[PDB]
Point group: C3
Chain length 158, copies 3
């Protein structure tokens, strides 16, 4: 059975844990819990293939160099977290020693009205990296499966 | 004589104290003074009614649950303070145990040129909460009476 | 030989040192080095005049009141640094006891895709101060000579 090693990175509070727990357990963690298990496993069918997702949920700035693909997460109501993405991408480029790493840019908290990052800004950043941009809500589940499954489809192209 | 219990909330440095002192004393505090009295009282006539404003000027994150109406203040040159509004609104929703609380969204420092929050962004956030948006300058007095008097008119609808 | 006393100011990490080292030594400092010499000297020809640039590279918040002209630097991928410009300008206004100080607003890191400050936002802020806006990249050298030489041309108008 094929295993996909996914690593979730991005600034503190963007919803890395909430996104991963929504995917794995179909539950929204509505609080900020600073003691959540980093390692998640799930058997899923993606495009007719039974596979294992091995997910590492990292802390807002080892884990990195074992990763096959990366979710780079910011929050659409957190301009600083969007600006911080380049530093996370530079870290991934350094550990993978490549500018061709399977990666999805994730704009989380898309359920919230206080948007300070336009879809077009994030599309432009993702384009500059040669990666897809997907908006998600860990709260409503919008885009959550799409973000993780798209990352698997990006790993399959590597 | 009718008393209106107003509470001013929002991020550090957005001008909660400057706004309240401009309303009450017709003076602009041009410095950042970290030891300002939290409690203000003023007898005013609003729509022909002689009334008392009992204003609590809170610190950038009791006071809350006694409040009848809330000014949720950000600065139009402070994107983080605009993003922080949702956390202040969530706090008000928690203490008032209602999503129908008399509230005005205030975009302060509208005299400044370094605008990073568009009027339309703030209008959209206020719309999502079902509340008015008003821009103010504690410096020029623009919108200051309008912000506080509108909050009184919102309390009168509750 | 005419000496131009230039002072580079702005928030931590915007690239004040990278800009000054790119101008003086034609090298991009790709790391964040917290122990860089503050004082730079260079003999240059600007509009046919052989002159000395005496440059003071300040830390993200003496140096100030000796300055004849100021580069006020933010990063186009750092909204907070753009918002912080007004505080640096207010400091310059205080030490020079004038609202007519030779000054250029510099939008640095223009090579980066994660733009959160629009050119038009910065043009509007610069217009409000009566100063030019120039975009730079300490990395590619885009606009670097233009920023410093424009500041010299602003000092010559004082
Ligand atoms: N409204 C909304 N809130 C969200 C969403 N995702 C996360 N949150 C909220 O944002 C806060 C932080 O979420 P969390 O998953 O702990 O963030 P994190 O990126 O893992 N933080 P850290 O890096 O410190 O571990 C929580 O209160 C959570 O409920 C979302 O999509 N919508
Ligand atoms: N230009 C301008 N400056 C303002 C305006 N309102 C406040 N300020 C300035 O912003 C700074 C902070 O104001 P202040 O009222 O102390 O903010 P606060 O929200 O009460 N801060 P805290 O939460 O720490 O008590 C002061 O230097 C003040 O002069 C405004 O409308 N325009
Ligand atoms: N991509 C890019 N990076 C830049 C640019 N200018 C600076 N940097 C990077 O940004 C970081 C900070 O640069 P630095 O010059 O040290 O900033 P500073 O304004 O002097 N910081 P401080 O106020 O603490 O002294 C460095 O890693 C540097 O390589 C630029 O134009 N483009
Ligand atoms: Mg977490
Ligand atoms: Mg914007
Ligand atoms: Mg105060
Ligand atoms: Mg420096
Ligand atoms: Na890439
Ligand atoms: Na409401
Ligand atoms: Na000026």
């Amino acid at each position: 059975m094929t295993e996909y090693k996914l690593v979730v990175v991005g600034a503190g509070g963007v919803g890395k844990s909430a996104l991963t727990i929504q995917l794995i357990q179909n539950h929204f963690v509505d609080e900020y819990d600073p003691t959540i298990e980093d390692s998640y496993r799930k058997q899923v069918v993606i495009d007719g293939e039974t596979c294992l997702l091995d997910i590492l949920d990292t802390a807002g700035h080892q884990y990195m160099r074992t990763g096959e693909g990366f979710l780079c997460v910011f929050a659409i109501n957190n301009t600083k977290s969007f600006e911080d993405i380049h530093q996370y991408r530079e870290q991934i480029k350094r550990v993978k020693d490549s500018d061709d790493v399977p990666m999805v840019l994730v704009g989380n908290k898309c359920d919230l009205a206080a948007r300070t990052v336009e879809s077009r800004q994030a599309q432009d950043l993702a384009r500059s990296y040669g990666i897809p941009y997907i908006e998600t809500s860990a709260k409503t589940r919008q885009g959550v499966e799409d973000a993780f499954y798209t990352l698997v489809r990006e790993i399959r192209q590597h």
